[PDB]
Amino acid sequence: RLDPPEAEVQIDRLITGRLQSLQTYVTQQLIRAAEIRASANLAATKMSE
Amino acid sequence: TRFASVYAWNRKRISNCVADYSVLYNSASFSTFKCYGVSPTKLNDLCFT
């Protein structure tokens, strides 16, 4: 519907929004994945003893 | 030839056709040609409600 000189401020309003939605997911996954490694060691020392 | 005053402006209606704005984009005495919301060069590619 628009022209490349004009359809350039309506794409930068989408890119900066869609990019600050992946890093939040990655950060939360990183924080969560360090709680299973704290049980995979208890379950390993509960087997040798 | 006959035109009405601004205090009693009237409207019209346009129905199914195939109408081209290329002829409307020819040179004339139009002092102002300003459309905001749609590029004035891609107007001959889409169907309008």
mmCIF file of N, CA, C and O in Angstrom:
data_model
loop_
_atom_site.group_PDB
_atom_site.id
_atom_site.type_symbol
_atom_site.label_atom_id
_atom_site.label_comp_id
_atom_site.label_asym_id
_atom_site.label_seq_id
_atom_site.Cartn_x
_atom_site.Cartn_y
_atom_site.Cartn_z
ATOM 1 N N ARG A 1 0.789 -1.221 0.000
ATOM 2 C CA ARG A 1 0.000 0.000 0.000
ATOM 3 C C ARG A 1 0.825 1.277 0.000
ATOM 4 O O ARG A 1 0.288 2.333 -0.345
ATOM 5 N N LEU A 2 2.099 1.219 0.372
ATOM 6 C CA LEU A 2 2.921 2.409 0.531
ATOM 7 C C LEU A 2 4.151 2.340 -0.371
ATOM 8 O O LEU A 2 4.311 1.429 -1.188
ATOM 9 N N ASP A 3 5.030 3.334 -0.208
ATOM 10 C CA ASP A 3 6.248 3.557 -0.971
ATOM 11 C C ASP A 3 7.473 3.289 -0.097
ATOM 12 O O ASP A 3 7.469 3.613 1.094
ATOM 13 N N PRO A 4 8.527 2.692 -0.651
ATOM 14 C CA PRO A 4 9.716 2.355 0.150
ATOM 15 C C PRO A 4 10.277 3.545 0.914
ATOM 16 O O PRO A 4 10.716 3.376 2.062
ATOM 17 N N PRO A 5 10.309 4.756 0.341
ATOM 18 C CA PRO A 5 10.714 5.905 1.169
ATOM 19 C C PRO A 5 9.793 6.150 2.350
ATOM 20 O O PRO A 5 10.251 6.646 3.387
ATOM 21 N N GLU A 6 8.510 5.814 2.233
ATOM 22 C CA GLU A 6 7.559 6.035 3.314
ATOM 23 C C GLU A 6 7.334 4.807 4.182
ATOM 24 O O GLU A 6 7.134 4.952 5.393
ATOM 25 N N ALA A 7 7.358 3.608 3.604
ATOM 26 C CA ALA A 7 7.170 2.392 4.385
ATOM 27 C C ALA A 7 8.481 1.968 5.030
ATOM 28 O O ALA A 7 8.908 0.819 4.891
ATOM 29 N N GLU A 8 9.123 2.896 5.735
ATOM 30 C CA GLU A 8 10.356 2.616 6.447
ATOM 31 C C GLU A 8 10.315 3.051 7.902
ATOM 32 O O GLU A 8 11.199 2.655 8.668
ATOM 33 N N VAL A 9 9.332 3.857 8.304
ATOM 34 C CA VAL A 9 9.112 4.155 9.713
ATOM 35 C C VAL A 9 8.031 3.279 10.323
ATOM 36 O O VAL A 9 7.873 3.279 11.554
ATOM 37 N N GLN A 10 7.282 2.538 9.510
ATOM 38 C CA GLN A 10 6.268 1.615 9.998
ATOM 39 C C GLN A 10 6.763 0.179 10.062
ATOM 40 O O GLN A 10 5.972 -0.719 10.364
ATOM 41 N N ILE A 11 8.038 -0.060 9.775
ATOM 42 C CA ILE A 11 8.633 -1.383 9.905
ATOM 43 C C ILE A 11 9.558 -1.361 11.114
ATOM 44 O O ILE A 11 9.703 -2.363 11.827
ATOM 45 N N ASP A 12 10.182 -0.210 11.358
ATOM 46 C CA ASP A 12 11.014 -0.046 12.540
ATOM 47 C C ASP A 12 10.199 0.066 13.819
ATOM 48 O O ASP A 12 10.776 -0.032 14.906
ATOM 49 N N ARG A 13 8.888 0.287 13.723
ATOM 50 C CA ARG A 13 8.037 0.203 14.901
ATOM 51 C C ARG A 13 7.634 -1.229 15.215
ATOM 52 O O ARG A 13 7.204 -1.506 16.340
ATOM 53 N N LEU A 14 7.767 -2.138 14.252
ATOM 54 C CA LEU A 14 7.494 -3.555 14.447
ATOM 55 C C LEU A 14 8.738 -4.345 14.819
ATOM 56 O O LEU A 14 8.653 -5.285 15.613
ATOM 57 N N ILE A 15 9.890 -3.991 14.249
ATOM 58 C CA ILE A 15 11.109 -4.754 14.504
ATOM 59 C C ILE A 15 11.543 -4.605 15.957
ATOM 60 O O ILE A 15 11.877 -5.591 16.626
ATOM 61 N N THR A 16 11.544 -3.373 16.472
ATOM 62 C CA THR A 16 11.962 -3.158 17.852
ATOM 63 C C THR A 16 10.975 -3.737 18.854
ATOM 64 O O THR A 16 11.335 -3.920 20.020
ATOM 65 N N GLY A 17 9.747 -4.019 18.435
ATOM 66 C CA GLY A 17 8.785 -4.641 19.319
ATOM 67 C C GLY A 17 8.888 -6.149 19.295
ATOM 68 O O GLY A 17 8.808 -6.800 20.339
ATOM 69 N N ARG A 18 9.071 -6.720 18.104
ATOM 70 C CA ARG A 18 9.208 -8.162 17.969
ATOM 71 C C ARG A 18 10.572 -8.665 18.414
ATOM 72 O O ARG A 18 10.725 -9.867 18.647
ATOM 73 N N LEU A 19 11.566 -7.787 18.526
ATOM 74 C CA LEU A 19 12.869 -8.198 19.028
ATOM 75 C C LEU A 19 12.955 -8.148 20.544
ATOM 76 O O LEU A 19 13.654 -8.973 21.141
ATOM 77 N N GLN A 20 12.269 -7.208 21.186
ATOM 78 C CA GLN A 20 12.205 -7.191 22.646
ATOM 79 C C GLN A 20 11.029 -8.027 23.139
ATOM 80 O O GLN A 20 10.235 -7.626 23.986
ATOM 81 N N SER A 21 10.926 -9.226 22.574
ATOM 82 C CA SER A 21 10.013 -10.259 23.037
ATOM 83 C C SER A 21 10.642 -11.635 23.012
ATOM 84 O O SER A 21 10.072 -12.563 23.590
ATOM 85 N N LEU A 22 11.782 -11.804 22.348
ATOM 86 C CA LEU A 22 12.527 -13.051 22.311
ATOM 87 C C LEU A 22 13.548 -13.129 23.435
ATOM 88 O O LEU A 22 13.759 -14.203 24.014
ATOM 89 N N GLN A 23 14.193 -12.006 23.753
ATOM 90 C CA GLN A 23 15.199 -12.021 24.803
ATOM 91 C C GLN A 23 14.575 -12.261 26.171
ATOM 92 O O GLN A 23 15.203 -12.888 27.028
ATOM 93 N N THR A 24 13.341 -11.803 26.389
ATOM 94 C CA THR A 24 12.657 -12.116 27.639
ATOM 95 C C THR A 24 12.427 -13.616 27.774
ATOM 96 O O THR A 24 12.667 -14.201 28.840
ATOM 97 N N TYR A 25 11.977 -14.255 26.694
ATOM 98 C CA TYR A 25 11.772 -15.698 26.704
ATOM 99 C C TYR A 25 13.078 -16.436 26.964
ATOM 100 O O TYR A 25 13.124 -17.373 27.771
ATOM 101 N N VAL A 26 14.157 -16.013 26.303
ATOM 102 C CA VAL A 26 15.445 -16.676 26.486
ATOM 103 C C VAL A 26 15.937 -16.514 27.919
ATOM 104 O O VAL A 26 16.441 -17.465 28.526
ATOM 105 N N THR A 27 15.803 -15.312 28.485
ATOM 106 C CA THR A 27 16.252 -15.084 29.854
ATOM 107 C C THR A 27 15.465 -15.930 30.849
ATOM 108 O O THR A 27 16.047 -16.530 31.764
ATOM 109 N N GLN A 28 14.142 -15.989 30.693
ATOM 110 C CA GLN A 28 13.353 -16.808 31.608
ATOM 111 C C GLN A 28 13.698 -18.282 31.476
ATOM 112 O O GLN A 28 13.780 -18.989 32.487
ATOM 113 N N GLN A 29 13.920 -18.764 30.252
ATOM 114 C CA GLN A 29 14.331 -20.152 30.083
ATOM 115 C C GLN A 29 15.686 -20.418 30.728
ATOM 116 O O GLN A 29 15.894 -21.484 31.317
ATOM 117 N N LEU A 30 16.615 -19.468 30.618
ATOM 118 C CA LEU A 30 17.927 -19.632 31.239
ATOM 119 C C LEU A 30 17.815 -19.709 32.753
ATOM 120 O O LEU A 30 18.506 -20.508 33.394
ATOM 121 N N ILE A 31 16.965 -18.870 33.347
ATOM 122 C CA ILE A 31 16.788 -18.920 34.796
ATOM 123 C C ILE A 31 16.133 -20.232 35.212
ATOM 124 O O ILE A 31 16.493 -20.822 36.237
ATOM 125 N N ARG A 32 15.166 -20.712 34.430
ATOM 126 C CA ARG A 32 14.467 -21.943 34.785
ATOM 127 C C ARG A 32 15.339 -23.182 34.630
ATOM 128 O O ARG A 32 15.204 -24.125 35.414
ATOM 129 N N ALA A 33 16.230 -23.207 33.638
ATOM 130 C CA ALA A 33 17.021 -24.404 33.373
ATOM 131 C C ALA A 33 18.095 -24.664 34.418
ATOM 132 O O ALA A 33 18.717 -25.729 34.382
ATOM 133 N N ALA A 34 18.343 -23.728 35.328
ATOM 134 C CA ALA A 34 19.314 -23.927 36.392
ATOM 135 C C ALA A 34 18.697 -24.530 37.643
ATOM 136 O O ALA A 34 19.400 -24.703 38.642
ATOM 137 N N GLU A 35 17.403 -24.845 37.614
ATOM 138 C CA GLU A 35 16.727 -25.489 38.730
ATOM 139 C C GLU A 35 16.569 -26.988 38.540
ATOM 140 O O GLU A 35 16.305 -27.694 39.518
ATOM 141 N N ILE A 36 16.704 -27.484 37.310
ATOM 142 C CA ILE A 36 16.698 -28.921 37.075
ATOM 143 C C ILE A 36 18.081 -29.508 37.319
ATOM 144 O O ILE A 36 18.208 -30.673 37.712
ATOM 145 N N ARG A 37 19.134 -28.722 37.091
ATOM 146 C CA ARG A 37 20.482 -29.182 37.388
ATOM 147 C C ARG A 37 20.747 -29.258 38.884
ATOM 148 O O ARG A 37 21.704 -29.916 39.297
ATOM 149 N N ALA A 38 19.932 -28.594 39.703
ATOM 150 C CA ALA A 38 20.052 -28.724 41.147
ATOM 151 C C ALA A 38 19.338 -29.953 41.690
ATOM 152 O O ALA A 38 19.569 -30.320 42.845
ATOM 153 N N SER A 39 18.476 -30.586 40.896
ATOM 154 C CA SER A 39 17.867 -31.860 41.256
ATOM 155 C C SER A 39 18.554 -33.044 40.602
ATOM 156 O O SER A 39 18.542 -34.142 41.166
ATOM 157 N N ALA A 40 19.154 -32.845 39.428
ATOM 158 C CA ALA A 40 19.893 -33.916 38.775
ATOM 159 C C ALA A 40 21.172 -34.283 39.512
ATOM 160 O O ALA A 40 21.794 -35.290 39.165
ATOM 161 N N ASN A 41 21.589 -33.490 40.498
ATOM 162 C CA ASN A 41 22.726 -33.835 41.344
ATOM 163 C C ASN A 41 22.285 -34.494 42.644
ATOM 164 O O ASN A 41 22.948 -35.418 43.130
ATOM 165 N N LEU A 42 21.173 -34.038 43.216
ATOM 166 C CA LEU A 42 20.612 -34.725 44.371
ATOM 167 C C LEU A 42 20.190 -36.141 44.008
ATOM 168 O O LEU A 42 20.444 -37.085 44.762
ATOM 169 N N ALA A 43 19.559 -36.313 42.844
ATOM 170 C CA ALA A 43 19.164 -37.645 42.406
ATOM 171 C C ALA A 43 20.359 -38.513 42.038
ATOM 172 O O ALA A 43 20.213 -39.734 41.949
ATOM 173 N N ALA A 44 21.528 -37.916 41.817
ATOM 174 C CA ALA A 44 22.729 -38.686 41.524
ATOM 175 C C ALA A 44 23.474 -39.090 42.786
ATOM 176 O O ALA A 44 24.067 -40.172 42.830
ATOM 177 N N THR A 45 23.471 -38.237 43.812
ATOM 178 C CA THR A 45 24.058 -38.628 45.091
ATOM 179 C C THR A 45 23.112 -39.457 45.947
ATOM 180 O O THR A 45 23.558 -40.043 46.936
ATOM 181 N N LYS A 46 21.827 -39.517 45.607
ATOM 182 C CA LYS A 46 20.901 -40.404 46.294
ATOM 183 C C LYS A 46 20.903 -41.812 45.722
ATOM 184 O O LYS A 46 20.202 -42.678 46.247
ATOM 185 N N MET A 47 21.664 -42.056 44.659
ATOM 186 C CA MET A 47 21.781 -43.380 44.063
ATOM 187 C C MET A 47 23.059 -44.097 44.461
ATOM 188 O O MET A 47 23.052 -45.322 44.609
ATOM 189 N N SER A 48 24.153 -43.366 44.654
ATOM 190 C CA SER A 48 25.408 -43.974 45.065
ATOM 191 C C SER A 48 25.446 -44.320 46.544
ATOM 192 O O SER A 48 26.324 -45.082 46.956
ATOM 193 N N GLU A 49 24.532 -43.789 47.349
ATOM 194 C CA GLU A 49 24.570 -43.983 48.793
ATOM 195 C C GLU A 49 23.450 -44.856 49.331
ATOM 196 O O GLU A 49 23.698 -45.677 50.213
ATOM 197 N N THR B 1 -21.473 21.535 -15.063
ATOM 198 C CA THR B 1 -21.659 22.978 -15.142
ATOM 199 C C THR B 1 -22.246 23.565 -13.864
ATOM 200 O O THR B 1 -21.878 24.676 -13.470
ATOM 201 N N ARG B 2 -23.149 22.841 -13.209
ATOM 202 C CA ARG B 2 -23.856 23.337 -12.037
ATOM 203 C C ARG B 2 -23.200 22.801 -10.771
ATOM 204 O O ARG B 2 -23.025 21.587 -10.623
ATOM 205 N N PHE B 3 -22.851 23.708 -9.860
ATOM 206 C CA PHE B 3 -22.206 23.354 -8.605
ATOM 207 C C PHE B 3 -22.928 24.026 -7.446
ATOM 208 O O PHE B 3 -23.447 25.138 -7.575
ATOM 209 N N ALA B 4 -22.953 23.336 -6.309
ATOM 210 C CA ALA B 4 -23.669 23.791 -5.127
ATOM 211 C C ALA B 4 -22.708 24.404 -4.112
ATOM 212 O O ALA B 4 -21.492 24.214 -4.167
ATOM 213 N N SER B 5 -23.282 25.150 -3.172
ATOM 214 C CA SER B 5 -22.506 25.826 -2.146
ATOM 215 C C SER B 5 -22.046 24.840 -1.076
ATOM 216 O O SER B 5 -22.565 23.726 -0.951
ATOM 217 N N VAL B 6 -21.054 25.271 -0.293
ATOM 218 C CA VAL B 6 -20.482 24.399 0.727
ATOM 219 C C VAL B 6 -21.471 24.152 1.859
ATOM 220 O O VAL B 6 -21.411 23.112 2.526
ATOM 221 N N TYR B 7 -22.398 25.084 2.096
ATOM 222 C CA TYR B 7 -23.350 24.919 3.189
ATOM 223 C C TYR B 7 -24.344 23.795 2.933
ATOM 224 O O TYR B 7 -25.019 23.358 3.869
ATOM 225 N N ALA B 8 -24.451 23.324 1.695
ATOM 226 C CA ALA B 8 -25.363 22.250 1.323
ATOM 227 C C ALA B 8 -24.650 21.237 0.440
ATOM 228 O O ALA B 8 -25.156 20.813 -0.602
ATOM 229 N N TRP B 9 -23.448 20.838 0.851
ATOM 230 C CA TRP B 9 -22.680 19.874 0.076
ATOM 231 C C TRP B 9 -23.407 18.537 0.012
ATOM 232 O O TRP B 9 -23.978 18.071 1.001
ATOM 233 N N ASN B 10 -23.392 17.927 -1.168
ATOM 234 C CA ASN B 10 -24.045 16.651 -1.406
ATOM 235 C C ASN B 10 -23.004 15.580 -1.700
ATOM 236 O O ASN B 10 -21.823 15.863 -1.914
ATOM 237 N N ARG B 11 -23.459 14.335 -1.707
ATOM 238 C CA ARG B 11 -22.605 13.179 -1.929
ATOM 239 C C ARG B 11 -23.094 12.408 -3.152
ATOM 240 O O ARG B 11 -24.068 12.784 -3.805
ATOM 241 N N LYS B 12 -22.406 11.311 -3.452
ATOM 242 C CA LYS B 12 -22.711 10.494 -4.618
ATOM 243 C C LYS B 12 -22.575 9.030 -4.215
ATOM 244 O O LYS B 12 -22.535 8.694 -3.029
ATOM 245 N N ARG B 13 -22.523 8.149 -5.212
ATOM 246 C CA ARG B 13 -22.295 6.734 -4.969
ATOM 247 C C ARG B 13 -21.667 6.110 -6.205
ATOM 248 O O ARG B 13 -21.981 6.501 -7.332
ATOM 249 N N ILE B 14 -20.782 5.144 -5.983
ATOM 250 C CA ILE B 14 -20.082 4.444 -7.053
ATOM 251 C C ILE B 14 -20.247 2.947 -6.833
ATOM 252 O O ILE B 14 -20.015 2.452 -5.725
ATOM 253 N N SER B 15 -20.635 2.232 -7.882
ATOM 254 C CA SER B 15 -20.942 0.811 -7.813
ATOM 255 C C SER B 15 -19.951 0.026 -8.671
ATOM 256 O O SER B 15 -18.959 0.567 -9.169
ATOM 257 N N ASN B 16 -20.234 -1.266 -8.834
ATOM 258 C CA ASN B 16 -19.307 -2.194 -9.474
ATOM 259 C C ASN B 16 -18.958 -1.758 -10.893
ATOM 260 O O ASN B 16 -19.844 -1.539 -11.722
ATOM 261 N N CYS B 17 -17.663 -1.636 -11.164
ATOM 262 C CA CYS B 17 -17.143 -1.351 -12.493
ATOM 263 C C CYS B 17 -15.754 -1.969 -12.607
ATOM 264 O O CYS B 17 -15.368 -2.838 -11.821
ATOM 265 N N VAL B 18 -15.008 -1.523 -13.614
ATOM 266 C CA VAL B 18 -13.550 -1.581 -13.593
ATOM 267 C C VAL B 18 -13.058 -0.220 -14.065
ATOM 268 O O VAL B 18 -13.057 0.071 -15.265
ATOM 269 N N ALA B 19 -12.674 0.635 -13.122
ATOM 270 C CA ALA B 19 -12.305 2.011 -13.408
ATOM 271 C C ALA B 19 -10.822 2.221 -13.145
ATOM 272 O O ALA B 19 -10.271 1.725 -12.158
ATOM 273 N N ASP B 20 -10.181 2.970 -14.038
ATOM 274 C CA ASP B 20 -8.744 3.193 -13.998
ATOM 275 C C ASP B 20 -8.461 4.620 -13.557
ATOM 276 O O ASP B 20 -9.050 5.567 -14.087
ATOM 277 N N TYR B 21 -7.563 4.768 -12.586
ATOM 278 C CA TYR B 21 -7.121 6.077 -12.129
ATOM 279 C C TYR B 21 -5.935 6.607 -12.921
ATOM 280 O O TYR B 21 -5.490 7.731 -12.665
ATOM 281 N N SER B 22 -5.413 5.825 -13.869
ATOM 282 C CA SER B 22 -4.314 6.304 -14.701
ATOM 283 C C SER B 22 -4.732 7.524 -15.508
ATOM 284 O O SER B 22 -3.982 8.502 -15.604
ATOM 285 N N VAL B 23 -5.931 7.488 -16.093
ATOM 286 C CA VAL B 23 -6.442 8.652 -16.808
ATOM 287 C C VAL B 23 -6.703 9.800 -15.842
ATOM 288 O O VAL B 23 -6.515 10.971 -16.192
ATOM 289 N N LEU B 24 -7.140 9.492 -14.619
ATOM 290 C CA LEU B 24 -7.325 10.524 -13.607
ATOM 291 C C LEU B 24 -6.009 11.157 -13.178
ATOM 292 O O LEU B 24 -6.016 12.269 -12.640
ATOM 293 N N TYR B 25 -4.887 10.476 -13.400
ATOM 294 C CA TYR B 25 -3.577 10.993 -13.030
ATOM 295 C C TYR B 25 -2.923 11.803 -14.143
ATOM 296 O O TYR B 25 -1.763 12.201 -14.002
ATOM 297 N N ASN B 26 -3.634 12.054 -15.241
ATOM 298 C CA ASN B 26 -3.095 12.882 -16.307
ATOM 299 C C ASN B 26 -2.990 14.337 -15.852
ATOM 300 O O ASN B 26 -3.508 14.734 -14.804
ATOM 301 N N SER B 27 -2.301 15.138 -16.659
ATOM 302 C CA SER B 27 -2.122 16.545 -16.337
ATOM 303 C C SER B 27 -3.438 17.300 -16.479
ATOM 304 O O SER B 27 -4.217 17.061 -17.406
ATOM 305 N N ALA B 28 -3.679 18.218 -15.548
ATOM 306 C CA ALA B 28 -4.868 19.062 -15.555
ATOM 307 C C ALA B 28 -4.559 20.310 -14.738
ATOM 308 O O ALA B 28 -3.401 20.580 -14.400
ATOM 309 N N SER B 29 -5.598 21.080 -14.417
ATOM 310 C CA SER B 29 -5.455 22.292 -13.624
ATOM 311 C C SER B 29 -5.525 22.024 -12.124
ATOM 312 O O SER B 29 -5.795 22.950 -11.352
ATOM 313 N N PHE B 30 -5.296 20.784 -11.699
ATOM 314 C CA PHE B 30 -5.341 20.442 -10.282
ATOM 315 C C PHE B 30 -4.164 21.091 -9.568
ATOM 316 O O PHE B 30 -3.007 20.730 -9.806
ATOM 317 N N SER B 31 -4.455 22.055 -8.694
ATOM 318 C CA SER B 31 -3.401 22.691 -7.913
ATOM 319 C C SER B 31 -2.923 21.806 -6.771
ATOM 320 O O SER B 31 -1.739 21.846 -6.417
ATOM 321 N N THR B 32 -3.814 21.010 -6.185
ATOM 322 C CA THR B 32 -3.481 20.156 -5.054
ATOM 323 C C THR B 32 -3.891 18.725 -5.360
ATOM 324 O O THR B 32 -5.018 18.477 -5.798
ATOM 325 N N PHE B 33 -2.970 17.788 -5.130
ATOM 326 C CA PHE B 33 -3.234 16.352 -5.253
ATOM 327 C C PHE B 33 -2.538 15.688 -4.066
ATOM 328 O O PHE B 33 -1.369 15.304 -4.154
ATOM 329 N N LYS B 34 -3.263 15.559 -2.957
ATOM 330 C CA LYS B 34 -2.695 15.090 -1.694
ATOM 331 C C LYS B 34 -3.613 14.035 -1.087
ATOM 332 O O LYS B 34 -4.697 14.356 -0.592
ATOM 333 N N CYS B 35 -3.174 12.782 -1.125
ATOM 334 C CA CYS B 35 -3.842 11.686 -0.440
ATOM 335 C C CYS B 35 -2.930 11.174 0.664
ATOM 336 O O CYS B 35 -1.758 10.872 0.412
ATOM 337 N N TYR B 36 -3.461 11.078 1.878
ATOM 338 C CA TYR B 36 -2.720 10.529 3.006
ATOM 339 C C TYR B 36 -3.375 9.232 3.462
ATOM 340 O O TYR B 36 -4.585 9.192 3.707
ATOM 341 N N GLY B 37 -2.571 8.170 3.555
ATOM 342 C CA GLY B 37 -3.035 6.841 3.911
ATOM 343 C C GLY B 37 -2.750 5.796 2.850
ATOM 344 O O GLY B 37 -2.578 4.618 3.176
ATOM 345 N N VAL B 38 -2.697 6.206 1.586
ATOM 346 C CA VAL B 38 -2.454 5.296 0.473
ATOM 347 C C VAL B 38 -1.508 5.974 -0.509
ATOM 348 O O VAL B 38 -1.637 7.171 -0.785
ATOM 349 N N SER B 39 -0.549 5.212 -1.023
ATOM 350 C CA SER B 39 0.369 5.739 -2.021
ATOM 351 C C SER B 39 -0.392 6.077 -3.300
ATOM 352 O O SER B 39 -1.140 5.233 -3.810
ATOM 353 N N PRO B 40 -0.229 7.281 -3.850
ATOM 354 C CA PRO B 40 -0.969 7.667 -5.057
ATOM 355 C C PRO B 40 -0.472 7.024 -6.341
ATOM 356 O O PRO B 40 -0.945 7.399 -7.417
ATOM 357 N N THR B 41 0.459 6.073 -6.270
ATOM 358 C CA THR B 41 0.985 5.420 -7.459
ATOM 359 C C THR B 41 0.614 3.950 -7.569
ATOM 360 O O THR B 41 0.761 3.375 -8.652
ATOM 361 N N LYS B 42 0.147 3.328 -6.486
ATOM 362 C CA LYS B 42 -0.282 1.936 -6.501
ATOM 363 C C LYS B 42 -1.799 1.801 -6.468
ATOM 364 O O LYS B 42 -2.314 0.720 -6.163
ATOM 365 N N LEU B 43 -2.522 2.876 -6.785
ATOM 366 C CA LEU B 43 -3.974 2.894 -6.675
ATOM 367 C C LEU B 43 -4.667 2.010 -7.701
ATOM 368 O O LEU B 43 -5.880 1.799 -7.587
ATOM 369 N N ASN B 44 -3.946 1.491 -8.689
ATOM 370 C CA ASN B 44 -4.536 0.710 -9.770
ATOM 371 C C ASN B 44 -4.180 -0.769 -9.656
ATOM 372 O O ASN B 44 -3.937 -1.445 -10.656
ATOM 373 N N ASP B 45 -4.141 -1.287 -8.429
ATOM 374 C CA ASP B 45 -3.834 -2.697 -8.214
ATOM 375 C C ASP B 45 -4.748 -3.395 -7.218
ATOM 376 O O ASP B 45 -4.650 -4.619 -7.086
ATOM 377 N N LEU B 46 -5.637 -2.686 -6.529
ATOM 378 C CA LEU B 46 -6.419 -3.260 -5.447
ATOM 379 C C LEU B 46 -7.906 -3.005 -5.662
ATOM 380 O O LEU B 46 -8.304 -2.063 -6.351
ATOM 381 N N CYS B 47 -8.727 -3.861 -5.057
ATOM 382 C CA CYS B 47 -10.176 -3.732 -5.102
ATOM 383 C C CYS B 47 -10.665 -3.016 -3.850
ATOM 384 O O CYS B 47 -10.193 -3.287 -2.743
ATOM 385 N N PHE B 48 -11.615 -2.102 -4.034
ATOM 386 C CA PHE B 48 -12.011 -1.155 -3.000
ATOM 387 C C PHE B 48 -13.441 -1.424 -2.551
ATOM 388 O O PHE B 48 -14.327 -1.662 -3.378
ATOM 389 N N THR B 49 -13.661 -1.367 -1.233
ATOM 390 C CA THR B 49 -14.945 -1.777 -0.666
ATOM 391 C C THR B 49 -16.083 -0.872 -1.124
ATOM 392 O O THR B 49 -17.105 -1.352 -1.630
#
